[PDB]
Each structure stands twice: as C-alpha cells, then as structure tokens.
Design a binder for this molecule. Structure first.
Ligand SMILES: [Zn+2]
Ligand SMILES: [Zn+2]
Length: 42
C-alpha cells in the first residue's frame, strides 16, 4: 500500500509523517547509507 519515505510505515506519506526524516535511504529502502549518499541517481 501507500507508505512513507521518512519512516516507511504504510497508510501515510512523509508529508503526513511528523517523525522527521531518517538517516537510511529515503528512497531505495536500504540503510547502509543515506538519501544523499545513495548511488541510485549516479
Ligand atoms: Zn512515516
Ligand atoms: Zn539508497
């Protein structure tokens, strides 16, 4: 279902989530790096 980019629990988005944004990958789902770090773009 819909899930969050911040914390990644379903039934809400990062725009709803007031859990501040996380250290893991905001996108690719791994956590051995952050959203900046991730070579998903590159
Ligand atoms: Zn969330
Ligand atoms: Zn990543």
């Amino acid at each position: 279902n819909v899930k969050c980019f911040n914390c990644g629990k379903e039934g809400h988005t990062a725009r709803n989530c007031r859990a501040p944004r996380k250290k893991g990958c905001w996108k690719c789902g791994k956590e051995g790096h952050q959203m900046k770090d991730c070579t998903e773009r590159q």
